[PDB]
Amino acid sequence: KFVADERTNSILISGDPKVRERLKRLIKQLDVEMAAKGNNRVVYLKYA
Amino acid sequence: IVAEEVPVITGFQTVDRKEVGIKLKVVPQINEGNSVQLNI
């Protein structure tokens, strides 16, 4: 089965060295961080 | 403001100071280049 800590932000695992193979695979799978979306933007008004 | 205030009587006559001169109150904002908008 599964654990993690967000003190550390770390996946802990309980189970197989097959769970160790595939869940080091999923250790790696969703590690990715989305690129900044420019969620907010400062616009310089020319006239108004 | 450039002004000199003469005495004014709105009434032994009372005198009230008001200012006569050149006054310019301007609030510009700049188009991001060249033209300037003026509230004057």
Side-chain angles (χ1 to χ4, degrees):
Chain A
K1 288 180 289 293
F2 319 106
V3 194
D5 180 359
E6 288 195 353
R7 177 180 70 91
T8 59
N9 199 39
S10 295
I11 277 175
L12 319 178
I13 216 63
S14 64
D16 309 349
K18 287 185 175 183
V19 168
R20 291 174 182 267
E21 288 187 348
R22 62 165 176 177
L23 284 183
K24 283 181 175 178
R25 300 177 190 170
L26 271 71
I27 278 164
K28 300 179 294 180
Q29 281 189 335
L30 309 169
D31 170 63
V32 77
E33 58 298 17
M34 306 193 57
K37 190 137 157 155
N39 169 83
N40 55 32
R41 183 180 296 180
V42 174
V43 62
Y44 297 133
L45 295 175
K46 294 179 69 66
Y47 298 91
Chain B
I1 174 174
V2 170
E4 314 70 67
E5 22 44 303
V6 48
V8 200
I9 332 81
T10 167
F12 174 15
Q13 19 47 307
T14 164
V15 310
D16 310 23
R17 270 40 213 316
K18 62 181 47 252
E19 66 305 2
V20 307
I22 297 143
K23 61 180 68 180
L24 173 65
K25 183 173 182 291
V26 64
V27 185
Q29 72 175 21
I30 301 172
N31 178 345
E32 294 302 319
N34 290 338
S35 64
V36 178
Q37 180 176 353
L38 296 173
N39 291 337
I40 183 169

